[PDB]
Design an enzyme around this catalytic site. Structure first.
Site, PDB file in Angstrom:
ATOM      1  N   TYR A   1      -8.370   8.101  11.533  1.00 21.75           N
ATOM      2  CA  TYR A   1      -7.511   8.542  12.966  1.00 21.75           C
ATOM      3  C   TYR A   1      -8.565   9.692  13.434  1.00 21.75           C
ATOM      4  O   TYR A   1      -7.812  10.218  14.548  1.00 21.75           O
ATOM      5  CB  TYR A   1      -6.304   9.046  12.650  1.00 21.75           C
ATOM      6  CG  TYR A   1      -5.411   7.904  12.150  1.00 21.75           C
ATOM      7  CD1 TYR A   1      -4.977   6.897  13.104  1.00 21.75           C
ATOM      8  CD2 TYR A   1      -5.136   7.695  10.882  1.00 21.75           C
ATOM      9  CE1 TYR A   1      -4.070   5.737  12.802  1.00 21.75           C
ATOM     10  CE2 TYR A   1      -4.382   6.628  10.472  1.00 21.75           C
ATOM     11  CZ  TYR A   1      -3.866   5.861  11.447  1.00 21.75           C
ATOM     12  OH  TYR A   1      -3.202   4.586  10.882  1.00 21.75           O
TER      13      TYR A   1
ATOM     14  N   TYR B   1       0.834  -1.148  -0.014  1.00 23.35           N
ATOM     15  CA  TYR B   1      -0.033   0.090  -0.019  1.00 23.35           C
ATOM     16  C   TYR B   1       0.850   1.109  -0.082  1.00 23.35           C
ATOM     17  O   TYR B   1       1.970   1.178   0.416  1.00 23.35           O
ATOM     18  CB  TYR B   1      -0.871   0.061   1.251  1.00 23.35           C
ATOM     19  CG  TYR B   1      -0.186   0.409   2.639  1.00 23.35           C
ATOM     20  CD1 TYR B   1       0.657  -0.572   3.139  1.00 23.35           C
ATOM     21  CD2 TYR B   1      -0.133   1.765   2.972  1.00 23.35           C
ATOM     22  CE1 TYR B   1       1.292  -0.299   4.257  1.00 23.35           C
ATOM     23  CE2 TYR B   1       0.436   1.855   4.141  1.00 23.35           C
ATOM     24  CZ  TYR B   1       1.099   0.930   4.867  1.00 23.35           C
ATOM     25  OH  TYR B   1       1.618   1.164   6.073  1.00 23.35           O
TER      26      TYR B   1
ATOM     27  N   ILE C   1      -6.957   0.881  10.588  1.00 27.05           N
ATOM     28  CA  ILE C   1      -7.894   1.592  10.525  1.00 27.05           C
ATOM     29  C   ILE C   1      -9.241   0.949  10.379  1.00 27.05           C
ATOM     30  O   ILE C   1      -9.079   0.021   9.452  1.00 27.05           O
ATOM     31  CB  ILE C   1      -7.945   3.043  10.032  1.00 27.05           C
ATOM     32  CG1 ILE C   1      -7.564   2.804   8.619  1.00 27.05           C
ATOM     33  CG2 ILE C   1      -6.568   3.903  10.885  1.00 27.05           C
ATOM     34  CD1 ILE C   1      -7.376   4.014   7.876  1.00 27.05           C
TER      35      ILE C   1
HETATM   36  O1  LIG Z   1      -3.796   2.022   7.425  1.00 23.97           O
HETATM   37  N1  LIG Z   1      -3.263   1.751   8.562  1.00 23.97           N
HETATM   38  O2  LIG Z   1      -4.053   1.453   9.697  1.00 23.97           O
HETATM   39  C1  LIG Z   1      -1.820   1.745   8.834  1.00 23.97           C
HETATM   40  C2  LIG Z   1      -1.101   0.446   8.342  1.00 23.97           C
HETATM   41  C3  LIG Z   1       0.182   0.691   8.426  1.00 23.97           C
HETATM   42  C4  LIG Z   1       0.970   1.562   9.060  1.00 23.97           C
HETATM   43  O3  LIG Z   1       2.263   1.507   9.708  1.00 23.97           O
HETATM   44  C5  LIG Z   1       0.019   2.550   9.845  1.00 23.97           C
HETATM   45  C6  LIG Z   1      -1.346   2.478   9.474  1.00 23.97           C
END
Ligand SMILES: O=[N+]([O-])c1ccc(O)cc1
Length: 127
Positions: free
Chosen positions: A101, A45, A75
């Site tokens: 977030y 990703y 998330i």
């Molecule tokens: O999308 N996510 O929940 C993430 C995935 C990887 C990361 O290091 C931080 C957040």
């Protein structure tokens, strides 16, 4: 660009149908099966903020990101979005803060109230 396109042309995949998570499939994956809750999922990703900054990328780390689906290890938009993907699929997700977030953000890189863009490739899933 891609964030604008998924914002304007993406499909709502939330249960609430509150447009909190929008999707576009970029590459169709294999067959019909999607991972199940508790599976170990392997993804590549990248994530971008609404100011254009790339805040994360697994490609840049030369390793996939691995998590157990549907356990709140990522998330909400990811637990929801990745659950819709077939092996080999690439999609775009546009995630509103309520599925990301929220007002807290995530120091240092994610501000408060941040809408996030992701490109996600589902590499594999295993029980
Ligand atoms: O999308 N996510 O929940 C993430 C995935 C990887 C990361 O290091 C931080 C957040």
């Amino acid at each position: 660009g891609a964030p604008a396109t998924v914002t304007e042309q993406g499909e709502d995949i939330t249960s609430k149908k509150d447009r909190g998570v929008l999707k576009i499939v970029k590459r169709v994956g294999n067959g019909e099966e999607t991972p199940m809750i508790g599976d170990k999922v392997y993804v590549h990703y990248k994530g971008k903020l609404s100011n254009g900054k790339k805040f994360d990328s697994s490609h840049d780390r030369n390793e996939p990101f691995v998590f157990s689906l549907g356990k709140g290890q990522v998330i909400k938009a990811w637990d929801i979005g990745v659950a819709t993907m077939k092996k080999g699929e690439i999609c775009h997700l546009l995630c509103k803060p309520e599925y990301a977030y929220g007002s807290a953000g995530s120091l240092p890189k994610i501000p408060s109230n941040a809408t996030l863009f992701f490109e996600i490739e589902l590499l594999d899933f295993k029980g």
